[PDB]
Amino acid sequence: QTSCDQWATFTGNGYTVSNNLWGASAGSGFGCVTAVSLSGGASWHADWQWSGGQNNVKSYQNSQIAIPQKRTVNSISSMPTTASWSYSGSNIRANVAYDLFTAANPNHVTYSGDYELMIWLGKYGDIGPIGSSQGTVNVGGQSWTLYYGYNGAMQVYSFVAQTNTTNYSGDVKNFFNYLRDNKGYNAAGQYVLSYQFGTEPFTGSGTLNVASWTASIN
């Protein structure tokens, strides 16, 4: 279905599509989400138009998978995912990214945590991730510009693709493994609270079409 309501969600078959316009207050405009199909993955698209709040994210329209029982990062064997998307619009200042929160407390709220892991498959405009660049890193056979910094008490790591990656296939476990082995990330004690994919827009007008998205925890 379709909806532009601030907190609309469409759930089914282990997937949830959310408008999640948490930053609508920061500007003028709208955001709508359309869930086409949630069978064997999520096919959907987000449409929006925003002005004002130059560097304030207006929302994170996204698709995510249900996680019945939280497990530690190290205990998980693989977190495979595939994504086929495209962005159209004008003066697009936004990204396309996976978003995952982890915390030592397995019952932690799922929209935040000790850490936030982002994987930006796309980056439009002069927008910037939380923190500062830590340089280039290789994960899953692809190069990424890694960003790190605090957003309050929470630590945020953002792996930003160096070219828009519209057809992606990877294992999120590779990213956690990188942090565990290079940043002292406590993979043994951190639980994966969420596994999401969507777009954080700032200004402009755009439509993120997600022809296909799959994600799972094994």
Ligand SMILES: *[C@@H]1O[C@H](CO)[C@@H](O)[C@H](O)[C@H]1NC(C)=O
């Ligand atoms: C993604 O595509 C837009 C539009 O061509 C471009 O401006 C931007 O630099 C690209 N981003 C990356 C990470 O290549």
